Amino acid sequence: EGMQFDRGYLSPYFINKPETGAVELESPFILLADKKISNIREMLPVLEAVAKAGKPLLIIAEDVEGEALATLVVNTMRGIVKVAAVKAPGFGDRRKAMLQDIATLTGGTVISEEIGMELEKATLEDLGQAKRVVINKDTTTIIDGV
């Protein structure tokens, strides 16, 4: 099954289809975080595991800013990783419910800080998957999730 929501790329530098100005990831892993990511350190483990696995990564979180955002962009440009980041849809309680929906749709697990989950301890089994993902300035489309 697929889904779509009104949240565009957090940076035009995630674009990998110049002509159209879109982001297209094939058979990617999907990280679902209910927190704001500002320090990349806590991300290294999952990033390494995904990079070593040879798959692209879509990040859906509260936000991805500062150094965090910058390193993701620079290392995708350097070909060390291939990732894209967007904010979670909706607000408040609706955001949590929708984030959980995507998880179920993709067989992923929401890394909830509320219930005390650590991103450093996140594993590939916690990540979701889908056949394809398309992102533009305004929307994110998940195609055929596991």
């Binding site: 990349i40 350190r41 290294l44 990079a51 070593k52 390193t71 060390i80």
Partner: peptide, 11 residues
């Protein structure tokens, strides 16, 4: 900025 053994450049 440092570079992990696998080449990831970060602060």
């Amino acid at each position: 900025w440092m570079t992990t053994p696998w080449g990831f450049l970060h602060p």
